[PDB]
Enzyme design. Structure first.
Site, PDB file in Angstrom:
ATOM      1  N   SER B  39      -5.998  -6.641   7.950  1.00 17.69           N
ATOM      2  CA  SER B  39      -6.422  -8.165   7.906  1.00 17.69           C
ATOM      3  C   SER B  39      -7.080  -8.865   8.929  1.00 17.69           C
ATOM      4  O   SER B  39      -6.798 -10.360   8.091  1.00 17.69           O
ATOM      5  CB  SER B  39      -5.733  -8.494   6.562  1.00 17.69           C
ATOM      6  N   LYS B  42     -10.120 -11.085   8.406  1.00 16.67           N
ATOM      7  CA  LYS B  42     -10.557 -11.801   7.603  1.00 16.67           C
ATOM      8  C   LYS B  42     -10.830 -13.076   8.245  1.00 16.67           C
ATOM      9  O   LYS B  42     -11.476 -13.894   8.221  1.00 16.67           O
ATOM     10  CB  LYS B  42      -9.542 -12.512   6.774  1.00 16.67           C
ATOM     11  N   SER B  97      -4.915 -13.625   1.654  1.00 16.35           N
ATOM     12  CA  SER B  97      -5.328 -12.179   2.307  1.00 16.35           C
ATOM     13  C   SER B  97      -6.029 -11.460   1.536  1.00 16.35           C
ATOM     14  O   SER B  97      -5.898 -10.607   0.712  1.00 16.35           O
ATOM     15  CB  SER B  97      -4.159 -11.247   2.841  1.00 16.35           C
ATOM     16  N   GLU B 133     -12.720  -4.034   3.051  1.00 14.08           N
ATOM     17  CA  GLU B 133     -12.062  -3.923   2.365  1.00 14.08           C
ATOM     18  C   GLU B 133     -11.993  -3.411   0.764  1.00 14.08           C
ATOM     19  O   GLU B 133     -13.199  -2.565   0.184  1.00 14.08           O
ATOM     20  CB  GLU B 133     -11.113  -5.549   1.938  1.00 14.08           C
ATOM     21  N   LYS B 201      -2.668 -15.128  11.208  1.00 15.84           N
ATOM     22  CA  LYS B 201      -3.600 -14.716  10.364  1.00 15.84           C
ATOM     23  C   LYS B 201      -3.040 -13.083  10.003  1.00 15.84           C
ATOM     24  O   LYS B 201      -2.660 -12.382  11.432  1.00 15.84           O
ATOM     25  CB  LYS B 201      -4.528 -14.417  10.093  1.00 15.84           C
ATOM     26  N   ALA B 204      -2.152  -5.370   8.068  1.00 16.62           N
ATOM     27  CA  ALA B 204      -0.613  -3.953   7.691  1.00 16.62           C
ATOM     28  C   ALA B 204      -2.169  -3.495   7.364  1.00 16.62           C
ATOM     29  O   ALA B 204      -2.738  -3.499   6.658  1.00 16.62           O
ATOM     30  CB  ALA B 204      -0.078  -4.844   6.523  1.00 16.62           C
TER      31      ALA B 204
HETATM   32 NA    NA Z   1       1.771  -5.011   2.601  1.00 17.82          NA
END
Ligand code: NA
Ligand code: NA
Lengths: 255, 255
Positions: B39, B42, B97, B133, B201, B204
């Site tokens: 992420s 992003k 997120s 995503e 930011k 994971a």
């Molecule tokens: Na997580």
């Protein structure tokens, strides 16, 4: 490492800091060791001048006398009876390394102490200006007066020429003058590939101190900020420009 | 070193790149090793979006369905019937997120391919976006798809948030969103001293990948750009935020 070999070859100490602003990749060698900055300080001095003066302010005519003349005044000694504008003085200082021009500009911004204050303001906690030309060139080993480091000089140059310390219009003026420098053909300019543009300011001081700070532009890509400083162990030692040209080659190769 | 010890204790690999913009001093540890960016992408995606759209364009309402929802939509799910503007979507993506928000924004800018092209245009030759995503989080060892390095992610973040890649007006928009992030209190934020401001930011991914990229402002001084990436050897390995918080403490001390 190649830099150590160059130090052996030229019997000199090298200080190097290069930063590719496009990748944040760096090349360093004694980046935090102090060296007398000598004439490289002229570039930072004009940066500060541009900060305090409007473009029209630069048309201001400055008068001086033969009394104001120091040891190296290629342009200024030719206009003693007419004076020169601040713009013309900045030109002479940066492109011909005119010592009197630097002194006149220094006085315009408040003297060495004011220059130092302004540098501290932009984040430079290292550069330590204390004197006028040409005494600023005489620094003995161990002293910090009129010295800086490769990292600090490169970063302050970067601040004025590439960052927002100055509005674009003023940044362009500084870069244009430096791109047209007449004293560095055998230094960083001799160590870069053809097609690469260079904006530099040279310096030479006691103990065979020979410096060059620059912003270099590869054919296609972001600018590289480079400071190559050097010195020898004898007060009256003579420098060899080839040292700087070779060091630049290694930096380019590395980057 | 301290980083090697942290890697052993947490049984993880660390990728670190920190740059003090005021001094050009850096802290590095496997700065050029690839990690799934997860992420963290992003923030880069919003940067490209602000590059293309005007502040007005940001009010451009976007409508979507329950079909457009993916695995993690804290905000977008509570707005499927009215739609959301691009600004709200950027807000959701950066501060929560939100996976659907990122996908909708990616579509807006042309997809992974366009994002990569845009990144290549600002000097980032490393970051390799290929998927939407949440699939982009699944990266196997050896693959470069949807990976980047600590040095590249930090440099790309700096370009959008601290450099002239965006007009001051849009830069502040990005900084504001990231400053008010709700997902990284246990990471870089947990590793900085009191009084330090953080815009970050989080990310994971598979193989216990846990990342955090940020801009940090000391009480006094120029901002520090920092990328802390980490991963483990097992596909289903669990990550521990303490590793990033601890790694950040070392970086600060070093700086
Ligand atoms: Na997580
Ligand atoms: Na000379």
């Amino acid at each position: 490492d190649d830099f150590a070999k160059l130090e052996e070859q030229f019997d000199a100490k090298l200080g190097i800091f290069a930063l590719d602003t496009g990748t944040n990749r760096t090349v360093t060698y004694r980046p935090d060791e102090r060296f007398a900055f000598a004439s490289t300080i002229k570039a930072l001095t004009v940066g500060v001048l541009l900060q305090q003066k409007s473009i029209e302010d630069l048309n201001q005519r400055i008068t001086y006398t033969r009394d104001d003349l120091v040891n190296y005044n290629p342009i200024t000694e030719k206009h003693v009876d007419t004076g020169m504008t601040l713009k013309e003085l900045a030109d002479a200082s940066l492109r011909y390394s005119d010592n009197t021009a630097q002194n006149l500009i220094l006085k315009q911004i408040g003297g060495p102490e004011s220059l130092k204050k302004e540098l501290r303001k932009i984040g430079d906690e290292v550069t330590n200006p204390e004197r006028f030309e040409p005494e600023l060139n005489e620094v003995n080993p161990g002293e910090t007066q009129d010295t800086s480091t490769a990292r600090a000089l490169a970063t302050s140059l970067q601040a004025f020429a590439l960052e927002d310390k100055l509005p674009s219009e003023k940044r362009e003026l500084l870069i244009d003058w430096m791109k047209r420098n007449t004293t560095g053909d055998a230094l960083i300019r001799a160590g870069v590939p053809e097609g690469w543009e260079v904006a530099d300011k040279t310096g030479a001081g006691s103990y065979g101190t020979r410096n060059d700070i620059a912003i270099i532009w590869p054919p296609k890509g972001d600018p590289v900020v480079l400071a190559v400083l050097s010195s020898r162990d004898k007060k009256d030692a003579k420098y060899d420009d080839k040292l700087i040209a070779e060091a630049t080659k290694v930096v380019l190769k590395a980057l």
